[PDB]
Symmetry: C2
Subunit: 333 residues, 2 copies
C-alpha cells in the first residue's frame, strides 16, 4: 500500500492504494457512520486494562473496510471536517507489537481505531492531543477483530490543512509519532521498512534533479515505492491545470510511482504484492474516487451525498464497482 498527499490549489488531495498478496485478494467495502451513532467496538483488547467498548459518533464518517483478508478492518477513513485516517501494513513492526506497553488509556481494537479517530476528532492536532492526554490508545498488541494475531500496521492522520501525523511502533515496542506538513517527506507513506530507514535510504538521492527517478532502483517493495513517490511528486507541476486535470495528474503520477502490478515477485519476500483498489480524496471538498484495479473501473462521489442517512449504512463498494455500478447502492448496516 502507498499513500500520497499533494497540496493543490483546489484542495488537499490524498491518494492511497490497498496492496496485498494475490493469494488472499482484497475486497473493499464502505460503511457510513452518521452523527449520534451509538457505536460498539469490534473485537477484544484483552491485553489492555481498559477497552474503548462504546462511543458516540461526533463527526459523520465514511470508513473503507478490507474484507478479503483483514476481516473487515477499517483501513481508510474520512469525515465531514476533512480529516483522513489510514492504516497501512508495516511488517517491520511485527516483532515489536507484543512489546507495546499499555498506558492505561481505553484501547481501541485495530479493526476500528482508524474509524474511531475520524468519528471523534477534526484535526491532526486534536488527534495528537487526544493521544497525549490518554483519551485513547491503539491496541497494538491485540489481534484485530476476528483474526488470530496482532497485525503489523502503521497509522497516519492527514487533515484538511495538510497537517500530517505518522504513528509507528518501533524497536522495543515504543510508539514514535512524526509530525509534518504536506510538503514534508511525510506526504509519502508506504510499508516496511520503518521511517528512519526510509530517511536513511533517501539521503543518497538528490530530489531536486528532475531525472532522479531514473537513478532509483525499482521494485514492488515499500522502500522503492517511497523513494519513487517522493521523486515523482517533487517534479509534479500543477500550474495552469483545471481541477479534473489536477486530479488526473496526481493519479497518473502516483500510479507510475506506486501501482503494483500482478505477477511480479519481490525477492525479499518470495511473494507478489499487487494493488487491488485505490482511493483519491479532496479533503477540502468531500470528493472521493474509488477505483478497483481488478476491473479497472472507478466511481466518483462525495461525502456530503451520505449525510442524508440517519443510521449506519454499508456497501460492498468494490464488488459494485467491479459489476460496473456508477452509483453506490447502500444497505442498512
Amino acid at each position: 500500500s502507498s499513500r500520497l498527499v499533494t497540496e493543490t490549489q483546489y484542495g488537499t488531495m490524498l491518494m492511497r492504494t490497498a496492496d496485498w498478496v494475490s493469494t488472499a485478494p482484497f475486497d473493499g467495502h464502505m460503511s457510513v457512520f452518521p452523527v449520534g451513532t451509538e457505536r460498539t467496538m469490534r473485537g477484544q483488547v484483552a491485553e489492555y486494562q481498559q477497552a474503548m467498548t462504546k462511543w458516540q459518533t461526533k463527526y459523520h464518517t465514511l470508513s473503507i473496510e478490507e474484507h478479503g483478508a483483514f476481516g473487515g478492518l477499517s483501513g481508510q477513513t474520512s469525515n465531514e471536517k476533512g480529516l483522513s485516517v489510514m492504516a497501512l501494513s508495516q511488517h517491520d513492526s511485527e516483532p515489536y507489537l507484543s512489546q507495546h506497553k499499555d498506558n492505561g488509556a481505553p484501547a481501541v481494537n485495530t479493526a476500528d481505531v482508524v474509524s474511531f479517530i475520524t468519528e471523534r476528532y477534526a484535526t491532526t492536532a486534536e488527534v495528537k492531543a487526544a493521544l497525549d492526554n490518554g483519551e485513547f490508545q491503539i491496541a497494538w498488541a491485540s489481534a484485530p477483530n476476528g483474526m488470530e494475531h496482532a497485525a503489523p500496521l502503521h497509522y497516519s492522520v492527514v487533515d484538511a490543512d495538510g497537517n500530517i501525523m505518522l504513528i509507528q511502533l518501533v524497536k522495543g515496542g515504543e510508539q514514535k509519532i512524526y509530525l509534518g506538513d504536506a510538503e514534508s517527506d511525510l506526504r509519502v507513506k508506504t510499508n516496511d521498512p520503518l521511517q528512519e530507514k526510509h530517511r536513511e535510504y533517501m539521503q543518497q538521492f538528490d530530489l531536486k534533479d528532475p531525472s532522479v527517478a531514473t537513478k532509483m532502483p525499482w521494485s514492488i517493495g515499500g522502500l522503492e515505492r517511497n523513494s519513487r513517490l517522493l521523486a515523482m511528486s517533487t517534479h509534479m507541476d500543477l500550474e495552469g491545470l483545471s481541477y479534473t486535470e489536477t486530479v488526473a495528474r496526481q493519479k497518473g503520477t502516483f500510479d507510475a510511482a506506486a501501482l503494483v502490478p500482478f505477477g511480479v515477485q519481490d525477492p525479499k519476500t518470495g511473494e507478489d504484492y499487487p494493488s487491488f483498489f485505490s482511493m483519491q480524496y479532496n479533503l477540502d471538498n468531500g470528493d472521493i474516487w474509488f477505483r478497483s484495479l481488478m476491473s479497472g473501473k472507478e466511481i466518483k462521489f462525495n461525502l456530503e451525498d451520505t449525510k442524508q442517512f440517519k443510521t449506519p449504512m454499508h456497501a460492498d463498494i468494490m464488488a459494485q464497482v467491479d459489476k460496473g455500478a456508477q452509483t453506490i447502492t447502500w444497505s442498512k448496516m
Copy 2:
C-alpha cells in the same frame, strides 16, 4: 510510445500509448474510412518515382491521427478484419531515412501509410506479401504531409490471430522485417534503440524469473520500457478472469511497465516524454478504449458503431473525452 499484444481467451488484446515531449503536447483525433471510399493520399512523395496517389478502401477502417505535433499523421489503425497497424517513434532510424531505396512500387506518404495498410489488407501475411510483391512501399525518405523532414518512425502490423510484423529502417537504409507472434518478444514494441539492440540488452535478463522486473533498471526511455513490458507480460496470468478483468489486467500491467508520468526527465535526452493518450483494442470483437491521460477519462466503443457511416467521418476524440463526453460526436470530413 509503447505497444503490447496479449493473447487471451476473449481475443487478441492490444494496448498502445502515445508519448511525446511536454513542449509539444499530443492531440489525438480519429477518422473513419468506409468500404468503397475513393481515397486521395495526403502529402507528396517526390523522392519516389511512383506515388500511391489514389486507392479504394477495401476494409472499414478507423484511424487515430496525431494533430498536436505530427500534422495529422495516422499512427494507429484498425479494420473490420481485426488487423491493427501502428507507427511509433524510432529516433535511431533517423540517420538512414534518406537512404531507403525506391523499389519502384507506388509509395505511400507516411501520414497515411498506416491507414492505407488497414484499408487494403486483412492479415499480417497479406501485408508482407504485398510488400514482397511491390504493391506499395512506405515513403521513408519523404516528409509526412505538412511537415519539413522525413520522420523517424517504425511500423508494425498485428492481426486478429496474433501474427506480428515489425518494419524497421536500419543501417544503410535497409528495410528490416521481423516476424513473430504475440508470444514472441515482438509482442512488445517501444522506441529507440533499434530491435537488435533491445534484443542484445534483453540477453542479460532471465524472463522466467518472476522477480526479474525488480532486477531491471527503470527509466522513461524505450529501452527500459521494452524490458519492463516483456518482464511484466511474461508473468501476467489471465486464468479464471472474466473479460472485464482480463482487459483491466492487461491495462494495469501495461501501465505499470510503460505509462510515462509528467515531470520525469530522461538524462539521455534532457527532455521529458509523458504519455498523453492510450488505446486498447480487442482485435477479435472490435472493442476499443480511448483514454486521455490529461483528464484521466476514457470512453469505450466498438468499431461496429461506425459501420453505418457511408462517407468518411472525423472526431476530435481526445478533446471530447477531456471534456467529459460519454459518446463520440462525429463530423463529415
